Amino acid sequence: GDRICIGYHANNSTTQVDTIMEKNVTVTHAQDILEKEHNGRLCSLKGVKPLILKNCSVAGWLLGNPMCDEFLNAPEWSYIVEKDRPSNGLCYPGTFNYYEELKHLMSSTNQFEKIQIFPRSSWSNHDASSGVSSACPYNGRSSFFRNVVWLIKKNNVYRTITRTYNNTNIEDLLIIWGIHHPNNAAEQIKLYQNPSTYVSVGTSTLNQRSIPEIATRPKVNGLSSRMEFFWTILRPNDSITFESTGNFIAPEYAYKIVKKGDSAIMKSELSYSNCDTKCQTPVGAINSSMPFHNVHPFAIGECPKYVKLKKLVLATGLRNIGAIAGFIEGGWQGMVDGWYGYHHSNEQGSGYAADKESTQKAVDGITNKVNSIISKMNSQFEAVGKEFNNLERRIENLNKKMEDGFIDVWTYNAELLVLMENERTLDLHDSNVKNLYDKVRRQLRDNAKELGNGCFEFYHRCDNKCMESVRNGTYDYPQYSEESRLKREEIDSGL
Amino acid sequence: GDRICIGYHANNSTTQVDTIMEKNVTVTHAQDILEKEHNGRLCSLKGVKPLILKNCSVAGWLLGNPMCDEFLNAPEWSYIVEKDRPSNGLCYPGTFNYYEELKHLMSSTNQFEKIQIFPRSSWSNHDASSGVSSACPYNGRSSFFRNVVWLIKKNNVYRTITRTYNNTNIEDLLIIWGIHHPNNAAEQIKLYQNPSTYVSVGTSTLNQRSIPEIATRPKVNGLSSRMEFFWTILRPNDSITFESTGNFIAPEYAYKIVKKGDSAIMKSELSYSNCDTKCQTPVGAINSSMPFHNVHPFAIGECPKYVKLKKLVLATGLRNIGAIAGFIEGGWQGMVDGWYGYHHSNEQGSGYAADKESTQKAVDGITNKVNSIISKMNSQFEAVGKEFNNLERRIENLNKKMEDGFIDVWTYNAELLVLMENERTLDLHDSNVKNLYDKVRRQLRDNAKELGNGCFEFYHRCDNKCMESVRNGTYDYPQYSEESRLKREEIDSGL
Amino acid sequence: GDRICIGYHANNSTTQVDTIMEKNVTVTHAQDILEKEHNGRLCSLKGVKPLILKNCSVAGWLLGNPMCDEFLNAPEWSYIVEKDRPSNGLCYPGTFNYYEELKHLMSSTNQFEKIQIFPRSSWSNHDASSGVSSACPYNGRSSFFRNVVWLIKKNNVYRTITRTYNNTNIEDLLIIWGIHHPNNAAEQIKLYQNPSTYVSVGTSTLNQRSIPEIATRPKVNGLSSRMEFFWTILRPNDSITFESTGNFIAPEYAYKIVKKGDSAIMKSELSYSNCDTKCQTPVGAINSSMPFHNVHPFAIGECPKYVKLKKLVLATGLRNIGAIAGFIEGGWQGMVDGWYGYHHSNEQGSGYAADKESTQKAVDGITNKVNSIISKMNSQFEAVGKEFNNLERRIENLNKKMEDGFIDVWTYNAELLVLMENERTLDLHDSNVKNLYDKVRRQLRDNAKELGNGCFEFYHRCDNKCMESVRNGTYDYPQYSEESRLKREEIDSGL
Numbered sequence A, B, C: 001g002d003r004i005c006i007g008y009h010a011n012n013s014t015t016q017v018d019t020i021m022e023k024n025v026t027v028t029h030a031q032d033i034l035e036k037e038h039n040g041r042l043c044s045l046k047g048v049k050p051l052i053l054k055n056c057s058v059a060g061w062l063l064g065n066p067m068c069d070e071f072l073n074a075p076e077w078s079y080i081v082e083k084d085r086p087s088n089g090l091c092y093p094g095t096f097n098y099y100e101e102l103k104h105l106m107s108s109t110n111q112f113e114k115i116q117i118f119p120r121s122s123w124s125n126h127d128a129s130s131g132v133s134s135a136c137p138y139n140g141r142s143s144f145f146r147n148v149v150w151l152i153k154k155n156n157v158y159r160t161i162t163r164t165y166n167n168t169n170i171e172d173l174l175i176i177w178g179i180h181h182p183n184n185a186a187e188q189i190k191l192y193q194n195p196s197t198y199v200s201v202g203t204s205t206l207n208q209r210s211i212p213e214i215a216t217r218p219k220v221n222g223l224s225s226r227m228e229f230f231w232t233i234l235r236p237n238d239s240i241t242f243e244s245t246g247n248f249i250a251p252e253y254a255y256k257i258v259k260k261g262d263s264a265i266m267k268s269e270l271s272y273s274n275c276d277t278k279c280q281t282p283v284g285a286i287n288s289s290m291p292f293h294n295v296h297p298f299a300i301g302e303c304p305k306y307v308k309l310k311k312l313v314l315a316t317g318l319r320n321i322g323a324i325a326g327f328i329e330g331g332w333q334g335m336v337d338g339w340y341g342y343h344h345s346n347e348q349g350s351g352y353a354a355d356k357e358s359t360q361k362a363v364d365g366i367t368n369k370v371n372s373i374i375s376k377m378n379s380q381f382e383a384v385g386k387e388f389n390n391l392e393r394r395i396e397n398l399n400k401k402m403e404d405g406f407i408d409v410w411t412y413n414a415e416l417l418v419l420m421e422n423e424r425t426l427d428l429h430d431s432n433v434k435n436l437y438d439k440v441r442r443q444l445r446d447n448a449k450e451l452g453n454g455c456f457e458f459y460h461r462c463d464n465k466c467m468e469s470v471r472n473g474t475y476d477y478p479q480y481s482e483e484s485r486l487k488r489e490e491i492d493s494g495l
């Protein structure tokens, strides 16, 4: 007898980590940092609801297609939800110039207030009720975009229109108008008498004369005619003037941009639920407690960072081992209040005491390294939705390559940091156990024989109050010097 | 005598590696991973030939400039080759709107099938044979684009054209038409009588009226007139209708997109050879066995990853050293079947046996680390060709900066991984040799004297069947305890 | 007595470094690499002055707004400075097509030479002096853009203009013209008689007919009319022809691009000073000696690399410690000519000599690692200025995300390299001190007793010429073997 041993923790764990050099390394303690679950619902963002467009496209909502809900309350929103191929858009077929730019402006917008600039009932010189069609039904009736007025000749005359709106508000106004492209020349005369007409609109910053492009087109939604829409932002104190002799599709209502901020247009097929989250993806919301996720690259809100992986586990503690009588062999199930420690084999002792002098010194620098690692990606790339028209394929692909590019880079960065510091964390543990050993043997020098399994045998008596002398770096060799100095020349000439 | 020594490999090698801290570190084993050679030819990709446009530009080929080869067989292709400044393009000078977008669509296209929608002989009301010119020769004759028909007034009349094609195919159709811009008003009447005309074309998704812009231009390829071409993709079940009173350049043939996939437009000056590769660059093909190359950033196919370096060598084994009598001094030329081992100096022994218990334990985790390193770049950035017109310089430069940006990032990533793990690989070797040592000395404790050069001298007799006891971690001190216990108190009072 | 100790440097320093695992680690030697100061002035770049546009926009300068300075000397420039919202632009209101593309061309341009292609006095058939207005004053007079001529009907007639310039120079010419959009039809007749007119311009590569868009606009700078400008680059040996019946704004002077190279348009509010730098940011110039800075992302010239951090310090030497009698405790203030060394406690000795065999071996591989680290970012991303119009928001944001993306990536890269190699540098120091120790104990084997504080006590006499035997790896045990062999069996049976 008369022994003491230097040893490390081992316990129930079967969680596994990876390094650069080995896979599936089981460890005592380990911290998952990759969130991979989601709730499949569409939720409010920190208490602010999304704008759910249902089956309507942004164009349909703004122009007020008869099938789309208006938002009379003028609510603010946290983001906008639009299905992948909405069914309710330009019910009257045509185009909507710079549509994609407008959707991009919607991403920085959180609240519209609709206001009337040119009231439907104020066009005295023109027909303001006939402009409706079988292509824009509202309860089976022919109807039209609620927000623009399709003016039509009155009494076979269409007197040249000039009309202005001075924007006296403090807010930017979104203003939408349009122009009508008939099938043929009879149609042009039938609706607007004047055979040759234009739609001119003037701003301080915007000058545009628009001309009816008459052509022969296939029937879309029942018609071969088309309607082309335009939009502009009228700055505070600026004014806009419209002049047309025909084919004018006149704004009735405009949109005051009353709140700018962090918003988004999310393409998703879900509908809303009584649910709230900090982080919303198109396929559902995320419990944003972890630092990384792989649910979906287009998450919005207070989100963890997207990485293309299926596992991401940090190591925090030792490897896991029975495991008998020293550190050379393995870890001690029997140690509980620490990571590295000792074992009293004494005339009274039984064993198992932890050196928390170096144990909290580890839980200090690892759990300060785990936080410091997470924060190293604070500025990691986050992707952002944008759309592109069929003639913008190159910049679409530029944008796709740029976003996939950064996601790959940051995925590489994350995996490497975890693998690299996992190798450093485990090797630290080895180091501490090896260093605990030396602290002990640097003390009991001649008074003890290293057995090479990780323990020392005493050439003297220690007693229990001395087995803390080695624990407290306070054992003095001279205390038992001459004692032991005798009793292993007794080995030298023993049996 | 009576010795044993712990030692490591050394051999013929003179291959050199680098770390963060040292350059030109010669090593025993090392794996080049940077492919830097190419074959200078243009080859088929995994058995599928490129489309070689010879001296023709994409525009020339599609419109069918008389000098360009048609591809009547409708072959599929692996990529398209176009010279840097092709000589055969718009032989009749003009423009080709959204040309660059069209070339970008060609990059996702692998096979056209040409089909006739409006046969040359079906324009009964117009001259369909006079439209040719000195600017588009075919064997010294005046001629024209084979794929579009330059219709001209018949009998001094040009009756307004309306004509339609319903796309009854399952495939997208590429359709190209154009319009003619004369020098002056006499020219306009001379060819198309009607003084004021248009070219209108209608699709479900496309509405366009085109008007002759008459102006006074310098002679290009002999003419001051110009021709402007347009293109659109007619979706399955859609139809297209053309209406013009003059200046119409009517499609005869359209292109069925029959195979989409991974393709490219490669700018290169080479011509084809009886050659096949897995990876093709503009200056030649690559033997894609390595994971990295520096030949050219625009490689296509099953390619290694492009990095801007001139060397990239992984270390796999020890440093290289004569080298005499222990690990403290250097490695042993005399060891052959392993990386770390021992040396029998015995009453019979001679020496040199490898501890493959820890040698295959290295060839396990290094050759698993070399594969694991290569795969860490599976998702590395790969550049993609695109073109831009003279008014698209900003997005050209955006695209150039984005691609150079990722190449630099991934070059940094590759070099750092190799240097960082090269430092870890060599230091592991040191560790294993130091650890082999301890395994031995943890066994022979009192029975042997460490000489500090890396060897032990025995205070007892071992014999050959004991020199495997230390090799198999199975030497028991008590076996020879009392033996040695005697014979170095014999040193204590020897000479 | 009779001792010797292995020890390391410690000194005045209080500079602190960081690693992955610890912050605020004080060290003996350390190298700041982050430049954070700037001089707040706008300086010449390596002796070449910027073009300071003062309150003029690029458009104002090129067209020659009466308030802007011309640069008659035709100076070359190192970059161009433009205020954020310049006050002197299109004094006559309108638009300037592809303005942003033109500014992007200015970034690769370092020198214009202005030349006259169509002299003001050569329009014999038109009024060339009346075209001025209250909106372009020059000393309180009505005036006009100095570089283009606003031609006006003469004697109530405006004879159709055709006019050409053959570019006989070797240099690309920048040519700017424009066209006038009146308020109403009376205005059109009042200035240009002909009711319906155009401005046509023909190049080999450029075909354009421009038509007056008459509309009713709010007064900008006093007028409701507008002027629209166009630009093109006329290649050497090419010619350009202008044809108009009215509304033509004719070039007088063109700009020969005589020097292309590295340039920039810097948005900044500063004005020039008698100052010169190697690196200029919009808020001031930088003393480009360091490798990294955080002053401003849009620096130009021979600049260090921009990273978003507030500190970036490399470690080069030991940690800093009184510190008494061995390496186990701490470093020695008393060592001066090295980093690791020894201490003579001899019958004559006092102590403190450095092992420069391993000290210069450190100042070799650290100060080769500090250079090698800096150069690892040679190809780091550098941001570049570009501008975008109000309908280019998507590519603006693409470009912003791409640049912020790379800055974040490279910031991550820089911090990690410094933290990672700081951990490697300090741990090397530990290694060297631990290795110096072993070199000594591998020599004095039986002749000395390790005291476990980092020192050895001698069982024999050494003398001063032997205390270099341990220093020069040349101590032979047999020299004092039988001596010591006696005198610690004297301990074995001493007191």
Ligand SMILES: *[C@@H]1O[C@H](CO)[C@@H](O)[C@H](O)[C@H]1NC(C)=O
Pocket: A054, A055, A087
């Ligand atoms: C949306 O379209 C689907 C058809 O798939 C329909 O069943 C659903 O009721 C529609 N919802 C709204 C709000 O229009």
Ligand SMILES: *[C@@H]1O[C@H](CO)[C@@H](O)[C@H](O)[C@H]1NC(C)=O
Pocket: B054, B055, B087
């Ligand atoms: C391509 O142009 C070159 C002129 O440099 C000519 O010699 C060669 O024969 C041409 N090849 C084809 C296929 O037109």
Ligand SMILES: *[C@@H]1O[C@H](CO)[C@@H](O)[C@H](O)[C@H]1NC(C)=O
Pocket: C054, C055, C087
């Ligand atoms: C620029 O504008 C400011 C007005 O803030 C004026 O005081 C200054 O003199 C102007 N400088 C020039 C060169 O026009």
